[PDB]
Amino acid sequence: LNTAQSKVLKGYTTDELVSQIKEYVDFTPYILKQTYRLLCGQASEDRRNGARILRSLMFQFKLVTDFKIEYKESSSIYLSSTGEQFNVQAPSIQEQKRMVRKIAKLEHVEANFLSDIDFKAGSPIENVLDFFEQISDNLLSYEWYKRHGAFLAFAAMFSEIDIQIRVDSKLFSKIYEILVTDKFNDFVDDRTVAPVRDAAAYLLSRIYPLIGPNDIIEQLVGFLDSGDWQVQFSGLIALGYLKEFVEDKDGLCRKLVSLLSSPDEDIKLLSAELLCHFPITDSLDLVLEKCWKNIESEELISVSKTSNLSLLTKIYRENPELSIPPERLKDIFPCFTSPVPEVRTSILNMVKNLSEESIDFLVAEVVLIEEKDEIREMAIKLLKKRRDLPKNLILHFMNVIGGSLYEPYSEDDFVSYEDLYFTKSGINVVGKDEILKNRCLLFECIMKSGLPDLQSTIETTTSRTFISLYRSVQALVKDTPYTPANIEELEYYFDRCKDLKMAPLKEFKKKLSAPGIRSIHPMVDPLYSDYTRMVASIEFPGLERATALFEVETCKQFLHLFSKMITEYYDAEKISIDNFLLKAYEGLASGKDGFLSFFEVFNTRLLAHSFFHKIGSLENRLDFFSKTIHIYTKTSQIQKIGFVFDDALREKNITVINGFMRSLEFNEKFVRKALEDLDVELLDAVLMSGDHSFNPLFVKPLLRNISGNIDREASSKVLSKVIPTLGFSTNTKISKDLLEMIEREKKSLESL
Amino acid sequence: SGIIPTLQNVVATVNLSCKLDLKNIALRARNAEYNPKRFAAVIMRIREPKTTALIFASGKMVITGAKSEKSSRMAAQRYAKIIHKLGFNATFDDFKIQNIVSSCDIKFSIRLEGLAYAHSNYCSYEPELFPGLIYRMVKPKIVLLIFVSGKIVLTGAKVRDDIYQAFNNIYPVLIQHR
């Protein structure tokens, strides 16, 4: 019966669905003997799981809480296991070399770098009162996973706070023993971990409340004095979990300041991390010298660098009279490029409020050559808010941004450095589509600070593209009347632009003569999008050869930038968009998807343009809205997008109807019509894209359809899509008229 | 010339110049595994650079998994760190790249039978035993695994130069046998 249900939950191998299995469980009469099986399990997942079951059973369950506060010294030592399985005979020293060859992938080659020296030798639970006896035992088991399992269980017991059960009286005594005695670590990551001692110390943080007035904390800060980093470690992690209950802060902090200099990197890490949580007042001049020294060490990688940057950031935020020393300024430049992401993020957060040219320059380098976007966003945000960037920054990056798109940045233009943006081989990995993306982003940043004239030219394709747009931005600011900038002959450019002459002038015109035919030469095709780009940007805000650009552009970011320019100009009544609209709309409703990049940024501006009233005529219309309907579904002026929703029906256009669903108001129209005739086919592809609160309306009508044999397959199909959603909270939003049914029906379902 | 070789593995060693208690190191590190019946050393793994280190009681250290001479020396230094924390007077002497393994792809097929005849002395080719031809070059002492796919794999190199020097003695020959 139920024992069968529990024995299938018992059955268990390999996944999170078993978490869902434990997430599933609720209330029963007795057994947990099977739970213990898990808490002794060697898996990191089962121990949690099992301990989670123990957590369920908390009521008026008795608990003894006598705590013997004894700091008794032990001579035990707790490791991974007893190691008795290491008393075995080692194979020949010939069979072994064979093994090393395999593991180190030394097939086909000779390996004579080991010798004889290298291979030498040195030197029953069923009763409940017995399920708690059993863990008190495991708290000190020689198998670490049993120790973890054991400790993980108690966390669960003391989790809830509210039969007869005495709790071990030597509990604390056992914790303390572990903390000083257990010497098991996980060195998998640079930041060391003490699986057992950790879980242990966390328990102590839950025990503390229900604990007699003690000298425990004073005792723990005593661990920081030990010569064994492992006990120090134990001290720090425990104190971390108890930091709330720490009084005599000055006495702990004094030691923490000391340990910032530990020879051991974990003690240094844990040290600073804990110190960030307490007031820093007296040691102020001291913890600054320490942290700066740690930062400057230039140890290629120390795990504590981030924690030290945090500690500085803190001192400087909490004491605004203090400012970073100009000399130490050159010690944080490297951090923007540091291989480790936590350092990069941390430094961009420590400079968020300062305005030094030097730092200004480094934040720009970041936006250009950063791997992670989330991190680039920090640097972008830092520059977009600026109206006082130095001219020499605008000028310098205005022509750094325009270097050849196939050569690396110059070590002479940057203070930062990576083998990914400065080597001729690194580039070809990043790909120009990124290199260009990240320039388009810096470009949107440096334009809000006054636009000096850039006389300096570089003469590459890209150089023209940007310096062109630059002048367009200038003109838009001074409402300069439009002058049809002149595009020279293909020849002209091939003479000036260093990036085009990496190509057979002849093969080039062939491509120009007819694209869609990927030329055989590898340099032309790329240089084709570089060209289509330049001309479009040169003739802007003429949009003749813009349609070309959108059709070939690989880099999605630039199409975005360009659409920005167009729209910015449109809003200022500074451009004519009509021909470009048409040519775009068409190219989009026919599979040229670069054009979406425009319609998203121009967005709702469409519905107030002549063209829109003229789209309610094209036979092309639904092919278009299919691809863009999300953009317009948000508008406030609903009567407008209204004419199109009527059409998606008439034409049973699923994609356009789904898009119209995320909005409530249109369900009201949909359902109020589905009841006049049940197109079950589309209902199958439509309904589940709306608010489920409506479903209870389709149950009776869908049964007639099956009762009498009508669309039997379809009806039955959707019917089993809707039934699992009958347990759904009806929506108060909808028309009070439709509640007169959502409730009328919803009622008859419980009738009786 | 034409294409560029890509590194897949680097083997290196160090002497921590110290007698290690292999058993202790096994019971003090969750990331180490130790099986005397299989092997008289301790296998310790870190996550980044994803690598593997063979630790002998003599204090000899074999390190594999690295994708560069930099990674190699780096992960090597991290394993020493763990030993020092673990209580032994470890040092870091005699680091040495023992082996490099790179790969290539010239994007076209090769007539193995032809290459093998023209060089029956330096390479063995039996397609009823193993797919592809194994070619033993003598200057530099490099072994190449050549497949019809056009894919090449070079091993036995002690310094990156040997990879280039060697994959430039074979290209001409891989040209003739398209």
GROMACS .gro file of C-alpha atoms in nm, chain A residues 109-510:
model
  402
  109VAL     CA    1   5.690   0.805  -2.808
  110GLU     CA    2   5.968   0.721  -2.563
  111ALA     CA    3   5.945   0.821  -2.198
  112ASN     CA    4   6.247   0.786  -1.970
  113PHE     CA    5   6.176   1.033  -1.691
  114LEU     CA    6   6.097   0.795  -1.407
  115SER     CA    7   6.327   0.559  -1.216
  116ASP     CA    8   6.337   0.301  -0.936
  117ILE     CA    9   6.345   0.564  -0.660
  118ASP     CA   10   6.017   0.705  -0.787
  119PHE     CA   11   5.838   0.374  -0.725
  120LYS     CA   12   5.977   0.299  -0.378
  121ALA     CA   13   5.797   0.273  -0.046
  122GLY     CA   14   5.801   0.517   0.245
  123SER     CA   15   5.588   0.538   0.559
  124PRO     CA   16   2.129  -0.214   1.240
  125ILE     CA   17   1.873   0.059   1.290
  126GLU     CA   18   1.505  -0.005   1.364
  127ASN     CA   19   1.431   0.160   1.700
  128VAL     CA   20   1.395   0.539   1.695
  129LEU     CA   21   1.608   0.598   2.006
  130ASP     CA   22   1.870   0.414   1.801
  131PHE     CA   23   1.852   0.640   1.493
  132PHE     CA   24   1.981   0.933   1.698
  133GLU     CA   25   2.233   0.716   1.882
  134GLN     CA   26   2.359   0.622   1.536
  135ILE     CA   27   2.434   0.977   1.420
  136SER     CA   28   2.594   1.090   1.746
  137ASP     CA   29   2.829   0.805   1.658
  138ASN     CA   30   2.885   0.922   1.301
  139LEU     CA   31   2.962   1.277   1.416
  140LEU     CA   32   3.305   1.131   1.488
  141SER     CA   33   3.314   0.856   1.225
  142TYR     CA   34   3.643   0.789   1.048
  143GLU     CA   35   3.462   0.827   0.714
  144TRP     CA   36   3.439   1.198   0.633
  145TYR     CA   37   3.117   1.162   0.432
  146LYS     CA   38   2.960   1.001   0.738
  147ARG     CA   39   3.080   1.298   0.943
  148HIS     CA   40   2.933   1.539   0.690
  149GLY     CA   41   2.610   1.341   0.666
  150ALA     CA   42   2.592   1.337   1.044
  151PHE     CA   43   2.644   1.713   1.082
  152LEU     CA   44   2.416   1.789   0.788
  153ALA     CA   45   2.135   1.609   0.970
  154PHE     CA   46   2.154   1.815   1.290
  155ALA     CA   47   2.127   2.134   1.086
  156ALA     CA   48   1.788   1.996   0.983
  157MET     CA   49   1.680   1.909   1.338
  158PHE     CA   50   1.767   2.252   1.478
  159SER     CA   51   1.620   2.407   1.163
  160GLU     CA   52   1.257   2.415   1.276
  161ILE     CA   53   1.285   2.524   1.644
  162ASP     CA   54   0.952   2.351   1.718
  163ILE     CA   55   0.733   1.241   2.160
  164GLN     CA   56   1.056   1.234   2.364
  165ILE     CA   57   1.412   1.274   2.232
  166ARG     CA   58   1.728   1.352   2.430
  167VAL     CA   59   1.999   1.525   2.227
  168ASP     CA   60   2.360   1.417   2.277
  169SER     CA   61   2.507   1.594   2.579
  170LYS     CA   62   2.861   1.592   2.441
  171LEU     CA   63   2.747   1.755   2.115
  172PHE     CA   64   2.948   2.075   2.146
  173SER     CA   65   3.244   1.876   2.279
  174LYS     CA   66   3.235   1.676   1.956
  175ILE     CA   67   3.212   1.984   1.733
  176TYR     CA   68   3.509   2.142   1.908
  177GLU     CA   69   3.704   1.818   1.865
  178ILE     CA   70   3.634   1.810   1.492
  179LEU     CA   71   3.730   2.176   1.445
  180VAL     CA   72   4.077   2.126   1.590
  181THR     CA   73   4.125   1.762   1.492
  182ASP     CA   74   3.966   1.707   1.150
  183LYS     CA   75   4.230   1.776   0.886
  184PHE     CA   76   4.048   1.706   0.558
  185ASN     CA   77   4.044   1.960   0.275
  186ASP     CA   78   3.928   1.997  -0.085
  187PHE     CA   79   4.195   2.157  -0.305
  188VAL     CA   80   3.993   2.126  -0.627
  189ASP     CA   81   3.959   2.506  -0.649
  190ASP     CA   82   4.220   2.765  -0.556
  191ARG     CA   83   3.996   2.860  -0.264
  192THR     CA   84   4.038   2.571  -0.018
  193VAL     CA   85   3.737   2.401   0.142
  194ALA     CA   86   3.682   2.198   0.458
  195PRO     CA   87   3.365   1.997   0.384
  196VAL     CA   88   3.336   1.857   0.737
  197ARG     CA   89   3.464   2.137   0.960
  198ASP     CA   90   3.251   2.379   0.757
  199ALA     CA   91   2.918   2.198   0.799
  200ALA     CA   92   3.027   2.151   1.160
  201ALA     CA   93   3.085   2.521   1.230
  202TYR     CA   94   2.751   2.608   1.068
  203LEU     CA   95   2.578   2.391   1.328
  204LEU     CA   96   2.752   2.581   1.607
  205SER     CA   97   2.588   2.898   1.469
  206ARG     CA   98   2.243   2.746   1.519
  207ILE     CA   99   2.330   2.599   1.859
  208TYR     CA  100   2.455   2.931   1.997
  209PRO     CA  101   2.112   3.079   2.078
  210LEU     CA  102   2.001   2.784   2.294
  211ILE     CA  103   2.335   2.788   2.476
  212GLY     CA  104   2.439   2.883   2.829
  213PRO     CA  105   2.642   3.202   2.885
  214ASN     CA  106   2.977   3.095   2.745
  215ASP     CA  107   3.336   3.179   2.654
  216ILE     CA  108   3.313   3.014   2.311
  217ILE     CA  109   3.380   3.310   2.085
  218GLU     CA  110   3.671   3.436   2.295
  219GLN     CA  111   3.796   3.079   2.257
  220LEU     CA  112   3.754   3.073   1.877
  221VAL     CA  113   3.945   3.395   1.814
  222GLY     CA  114   4.211   3.202   2.002
  223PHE     CA  115   4.239   2.968   1.703
  224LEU     CA  116   4.369   3.255   1.491
  225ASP     CA  117   4.686   3.232   1.700
  226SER     CA  118   4.771   2.875   1.599
  227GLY     CA  119   5.064   2.788   1.374
  228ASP     CA  120   4.850   2.540   1.183
  229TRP     CA  121   4.663   2.712   0.899
  230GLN     CA  122   4.401   2.440   0.926
  231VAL     CA  123   4.293   2.534   1.276
  232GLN     CA  124   4.316   2.903   1.188
  233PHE     CA  125   4.091   2.814   0.896
  234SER     CA  126   3.850   2.641   1.136
  235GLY     CA  127   3.846   2.948   1.356
  236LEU     CA  128   3.773   3.192   1.077
  237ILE     CA  129   3.488   2.993   0.920
  238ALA     CA  130   3.316   2.944   1.256
  239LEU     CA  131   3.353   3.312   1.346
  240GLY     CA  132   3.208   3.394   1.007
  241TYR     CA  133   2.887   3.206   1.088
  242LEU     CA  134   2.877   3.368   1.432
  243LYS     CA  135   2.972   3.722   1.330
  244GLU     CA  136   2.638   3.854   1.460
  245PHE     CA  137   2.706   3.731   1.811
  246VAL     CA  138   3.053   3.885   1.815
  247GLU     CA  139   3.104   4.148   2.083
  248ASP     CA  140   3.448   4.285   2.168
  249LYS     CA  141   3.480   4.348   1.795
  250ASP     CA  142   3.804   4.545   1.842
  251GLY     CA  143   3.963   4.229   1.982
  252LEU     CA  144   3.873   4.013   1.684
  253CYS     CA  145   3.949   4.283   1.426
  254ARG     CA  146   4.295   4.340   1.574
  255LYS     CA  147   4.377   3.976   1.493
  256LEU     CA  148   4.208   3.983   1.153
  257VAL     CA  149   4.422   4.281   1.062
  258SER     CA  150   4.722   4.074   1.163
  259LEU     CA  151   4.621   3.776   0.947
  260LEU     CA  152   4.587   3.990   0.633
  261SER     CA  153   4.958   3.912   0.601
  262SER     CA  154   4.946   3.536   0.663
  263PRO     CA  155   5.186   3.335   0.444
  264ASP     CA  156   4.882   3.120   0.368
  265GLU     CA  157   4.648   3.254   0.100
  266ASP     CA  158   4.331   3.103   0.248
  267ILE     CA  159   4.392   3.264   0.586
  268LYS     CA  160   4.447   3.589   0.394
  269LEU     CA  161   4.124   3.545   0.199
  270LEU     CA  162   3.898   3.436   0.485
  271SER     CA  163   4.066   3.709   0.692
  272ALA     CA  164   3.975   4.004   0.471
  273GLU     CA  165   3.635   3.861   0.380
  274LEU     CA  166   3.540   3.852   0.749
  275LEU     CA  167   3.690   4.194   0.820
  276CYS     CA  168   3.464   4.359   0.564
  277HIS     CA  169   3.171   4.287   0.793
  278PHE     CA  170   3.299   4.482   1.092
  279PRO     CA  171   3.369   4.852   1.163
  280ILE     CA  172   3.721   4.972   1.084
  281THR     CA  173   3.835   5.275   1.282
  282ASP     CA  174   4.164   5.236   1.471
  283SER     CA  175   4.351   5.001   1.240
  284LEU     CA  176   4.258   5.233   0.953
  285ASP     CA  177   4.606   5.351   0.849
  286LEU     CA  178   4.734   4.997   0.897
  287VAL     CA  179   4.484   4.784   0.700
  288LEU     CA  180   4.536   5.022   0.409
  289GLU     CA  181   4.911   4.959   0.387
  290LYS     CA  182   4.849   4.584   0.409
  291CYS     CA  183   4.579   4.571   0.143
  292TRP     CA  184   4.775   4.792  -0.095
  293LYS     CA  185   5.082   4.571  -0.053
  294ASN     CA  186   4.877   4.259  -0.124
  295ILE     CA  187   4.737   4.429  -0.434
  296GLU     CA  188   5.078   4.530  -0.565
  297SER     CA  189   5.248   4.196  -0.498
  298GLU     CA  190   5.188   4.112  -0.864
  299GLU     CA  191   5.168   3.750  -0.764
  300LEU     CA  192   5.023   3.630  -1.093
  301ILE     CA  193   4.717   3.489  -0.916
  302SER     CA  194   4.626   3.512  -0.549
  303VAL     CA  195   4.270   3.428  -0.445
  304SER     CA  196   4.270   3.714  -0.196
  305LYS     CA  197   4.320   3.997  -0.448
  306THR     CA  198   3.944   4.045  -0.482
  307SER     CA  199   3.891   4.038  -0.105
  308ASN     CA  200   4.162   4.301  -0.067
  309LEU     CA  201   4.003   4.526  -0.331
  310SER     CA  202   3.679   4.489  -0.138
  311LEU     CA  203   3.848   4.594   0.185
  312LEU     CA  204   3.991   4.905   0.018
  313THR     CA  205   3.663   4.993  -0.152
  314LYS     CA  206   3.511   4.976   0.197
  315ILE     CA  207   3.763   5.199   0.375
  316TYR     CA  208   3.724   5.460   0.103
  317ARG     CA  209   3.344   5.448   0.097
  318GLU     CA  210   3.303   5.462   0.476
  319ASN     CA  211   3.559   5.738   0.524
  320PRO     CA  212   3.500   5.996   0.247
  321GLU     CA  213   3.777   6.227   0.374
  322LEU     CA  214   4.018   5.963   0.246
  323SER     CA  215   4.108   5.940  -0.120
  324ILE     CA  216   4.323   5.697  -0.321
  325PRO     CA  217   4.691   5.804  -0.324
  326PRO     CA  218   4.800   5.925  -0.670
  327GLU     CA  219   5.105   5.698  -0.658
  328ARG     CA  220   4.911   5.377  -0.592
  329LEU     CA  221   4.692   5.470  -0.886
  330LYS     CA  222   4.916   5.280  -1.128
  331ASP     CA  223   4.868   4.966  -0.918
  332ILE     CA  224   4.502   4.919  -1.015
  333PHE     CA  225   4.535   4.968  -1.392
  334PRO     CA  226   4.620   4.597  -1.433
  335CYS     CA  227   4.300   4.492  -1.256
  336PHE     CA  228   4.074   4.591  -1.546
  337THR     CA  229   4.244   4.321  -1.754
  338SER     CA  230   4.313   4.060  -1.484
  339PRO     CA  231   4.228   3.708  -1.607
  340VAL     CA  232   3.994   3.656  -1.313
  341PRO     CA  233   3.638   3.805  -1.348
  342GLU     CA  234   3.583   3.883  -0.979
  343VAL     CA  235   3.881   4.119  -0.991
  344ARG     CA  236   3.762   4.291  -1.307
  345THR     CA  237   3.416   4.344  -1.161
  346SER     CA  238   3.556   4.456  -0.825
  347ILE     CA  239   3.783   4.723  -0.973
  348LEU     CA  240   3.506   4.873  -1.191
  349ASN     CA  241   3.304   4.909  -0.874
  350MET     CA  242   3.583   5.072  -0.677
  351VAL     CA  243   3.625   5.352  -0.932
  352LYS     CA  244   3.253   5.416  -0.989
  353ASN     CA  245   3.267   5.762  -0.836
  354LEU     CA  246   3.600   5.907  -0.948
  355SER     CA  247   3.705   6.121  -1.245
  356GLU     CA  248   4.073   6.078  -1.327
  357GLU     CA  249   4.167   6.092  -1.696
  358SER     CA  250   4.388   5.785  -1.658
  359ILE     CA  251   4.102   5.578  -1.514
  360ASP     CA  252   3.865   5.725  -1.773
  361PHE     CA  253   4.094   5.587  -2.041
  362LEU     CA  254   4.107   5.240  -1.887
  363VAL     CA  255   3.729   5.212  -1.862
  364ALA     CA  256   3.714   5.268  -2.238
  365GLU     CA  257   3.975   5.001  -2.309
  366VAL     CA  258   3.749   4.770  -2.110
  367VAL     CA  259   3.444   4.835  -2.328
  368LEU     CA  260   3.654   4.745  -2.634
  369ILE     CA  261   3.843   4.433  -2.524
  370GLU     CA  262   3.634   4.265  -2.252
  371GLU     CA  263   3.517   3.906  -2.294
  372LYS     CA  264   3.205   3.907  -2.076
  373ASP     CA  265   2.918   4.140  -2.171
  374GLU     CA  266   2.778   4.169  -1.817
  375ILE     CA  267   3.114   4.319  -1.721
  376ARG     CA  268   3.133   4.553  -2.021
  377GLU     CA  269   2.795   4.687  -1.912
  378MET     CA  270   2.956   4.814  -1.591
  379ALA     CA  271   3.208   5.016  -1.792
  380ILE     CA  272   2.950   5.138  -2.040
  381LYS     CA  273   2.728   5.260  -1.757
  382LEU     CA  274   3.028   5.445  -1.612
  383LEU     CA  275   3.081   5.649  -1.929
  384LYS     CA  276   2.725   5.713  -2.053
  385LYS     CA  277   2.667   5.930  -1.745
  386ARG     CA  278   2.947   6.167  -1.837
  387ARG     CA  279   2.934   6.514  -1.985
  388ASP     CA  280   3.293   6.601  -1.894
  389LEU     CA  281   3.514   6.343  -2.065
  390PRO     CA  282   3.846   6.493  -2.182
  391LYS     CA  283   3.888   6.586  -2.549
  392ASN     CA  284   4.209   6.386  -2.570
  393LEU     CA  285   4.003   6.079  -2.477
  394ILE     CA  286   3.748   6.151  -2.748
  395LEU     CA  287   4.021   6.209  -3.006
  396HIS     CA  288   4.243   5.916  -2.909
  397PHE     CA  289   3.966   5.655  -2.918
  398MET     CA  290   3.799   5.817  -3.220
  399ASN     CA  291   4.089   5.691  -3.430
  400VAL     CA  292   4.176   5.384  -3.228
  401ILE     CA  293   3.820   5.282  -3.308
  402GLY     CA  294   3.912   5.324  -3.673
  403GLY     CA  295   4.221   5.106  -3.699
  404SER     CA  296   4.227   4.831  -3.958
  405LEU     CA  297   3.969   4.569  -3.866
  406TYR     CA  298   4.219   4.293  -3.948
  407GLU     CA  299   4.519   4.414  -3.747
  408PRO     CA  300   4.544   4.402  -3.364
  409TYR     CA  301   4.534   4.707  -3.140
  410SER     CA  302   4.870   4.872  -3.077
  411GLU     CA  303   5.044   4.812  -2.745
  412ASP     CA  304   5.111   5.184  -2.784
  413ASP     CA  305   4.743   5.281  -2.777
  414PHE     CA  306   4.650   5.078  -2.470
  415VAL     CA  307   4.772   5.052  -2.115
  416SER     CA  308   4.603   4.714  -2.085
  417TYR     CA  309   4.709   4.402  -2.274
  418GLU     CA  310   4.583   4.059  -2.376
  419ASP     CA  311   4.715   3.797  -2.617
  420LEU     CA  312   4.362   3.797  -2.757
  421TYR     CA  313   4.346   4.151  -2.895
  422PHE     CA  314   4.714   4.233  -2.951
  423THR     CA  315   4.846   3.933  -3.145
  424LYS     CA  316   4.783   3.878  -3.516
  425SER     CA  317   4.669   3.526  -3.424
  426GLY     CA  318   4.439   3.627  -3.139
  427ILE     CA  319   4.225   3.850  -3.358
  428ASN     CA  320   4.132   3.571  -3.599
  429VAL     CA  321   3.981   3.396  -3.298
  430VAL     CA  322   3.766   3.682  -3.169
  431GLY     CA  323   3.642   3.754  -3.519
  432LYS     CA  324   3.575   4.099  -3.660
  433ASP     CA  325   3.202   4.082  -3.584
  434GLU     CA  326   3.292   4.118  -3.215
  435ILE     CA  327   3.578   4.360  -3.264
  436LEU     CA  328   3.334   4.584  -3.450
  437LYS     CA  329   3.052   4.528  -3.200
  438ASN     CA  330   3.264   4.652  -2.911
  439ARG     CA  331   3.367   4.961  -3.105
  440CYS     CA  332   3.007   5.050  -3.183
  441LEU     CA  333   2.943   5.036  -2.809
  442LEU     CA  334   3.229   5.264  -2.708
  443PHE     CA  335   3.110   5.498  -2.984
  444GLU     CA  336   2.770   5.549  -2.821
  445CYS     CA  337   2.950   5.644  -2.498
  446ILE     CA  338   3.198   5.911  -2.600
  447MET     CA  339   2.952   6.138  -2.783
  448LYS     CA  340   2.783   6.313  -2.491
  449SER     CA  341   3.081   6.526  -2.389
  450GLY     CA  342   3.117   6.792  -2.656
  451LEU     CA  343   3.236   6.711  -3.004
  452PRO     CA  344   3.571   6.862  -3.104
  453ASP     CA  345   3.666   6.850  -3.473
  454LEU     CA  346   3.869   6.545  -3.567
  455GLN     CA  347   4.116   6.661  -3.831
  456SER     CA  348   4.322   6.345  -3.787
  457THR     CA  349   4.248   6.067  -4.032
  458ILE     CA  350   4.375   5.708  -4.048
  459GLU     CA  351   4.247   5.604  -4.390
  460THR     CA  352   4.099   5.258  -4.347
  461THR     CA  353   3.748   5.152  -4.442
  462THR     CA  354   3.630   5.151  -4.081
  463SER     CA  355   3.802   5.484  -4.016
  464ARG     CA  356   3.572   5.641  -4.277
  465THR     CA  357   3.264   5.467  -4.144
  466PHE     CA  358   3.300   5.609  -3.792
  467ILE     CA  359   3.441   5.951  -3.876
  468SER     CA  360   3.142   5.977  -4.111
  469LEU     CA  361   2.884   5.897  -3.846
  470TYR     CA  362   3.077   6.126  -3.612
  471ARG     CA  363   3.006   6.421  -3.841
  472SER     CA  364   2.643   6.312  -3.864
  473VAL     CA  365   2.614   6.321  -3.484
  474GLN     CA  366   2.779   6.663  -3.493
  475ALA     CA  367   2.531   6.792  -3.751
  476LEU     CA  368   2.231   6.656  -3.562
  477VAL     CA  369   2.343   6.859  -3.259
  478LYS     CA  370   2.376   7.185  -3.452
  479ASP     CA  371   2.072   7.124  -3.675
  480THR     CA  372   2.306   7.164  -3.973
  481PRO     CA  373   2.117   7.171  -4.306
  482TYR     CA  374   2.170   6.860  -4.517
  483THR     CA  375   2.447   6.847  -4.778
  484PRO     CA  376   2.453   6.533  -5.000
  485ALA     CA  377   2.802   6.414  -4.900
  486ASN     CA  378   2.987   6.291  -5.207
  487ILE     CA  379   3.083   5.928  -5.263
  488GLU     CA  380   3.388   5.896  -5.489
  489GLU     CA  381   3.467   5.617  -5.734
  490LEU     CA  382   3.553   5.267  -5.615
  491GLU     CA  383   3.902   5.338  -5.748
  492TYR     CA  384   3.949   5.640  -5.519
  493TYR     CA  385   3.902   5.430  -5.207
  494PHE     CA  386   4.121   5.145  -5.328
  495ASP     CA  387   4.402   5.399  -5.338
  496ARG     CA  388   4.345   5.541  -4.989
  497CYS     CA  389   4.217   5.262  -4.764
  498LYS     CA  390   4.482   5.015  -4.643
  499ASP     CA  391   4.224   4.745  -4.572
  500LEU     CA  392   4.076   4.729  -4.922
  501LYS     CA  393   4.414   4.684  -5.090
  502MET     CA  394   4.445   4.348  -4.918
  503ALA     CA  395   4.241   4.240  -5.216
  504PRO     CA  396   4.260   4.186  -5.594
  505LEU     CA  397   4.103   4.507  -5.728
  506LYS     CA  398   3.978   4.294  -6.015
  507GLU     CA  399   3.822   4.011  -5.815
  508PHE     CA  400   3.662   4.292  -5.615
  509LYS     CA  401   3.455   4.449  -5.893
  510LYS     CA  402   3.348   4.094  -5.980
   0.00000   0.00000   0.00000
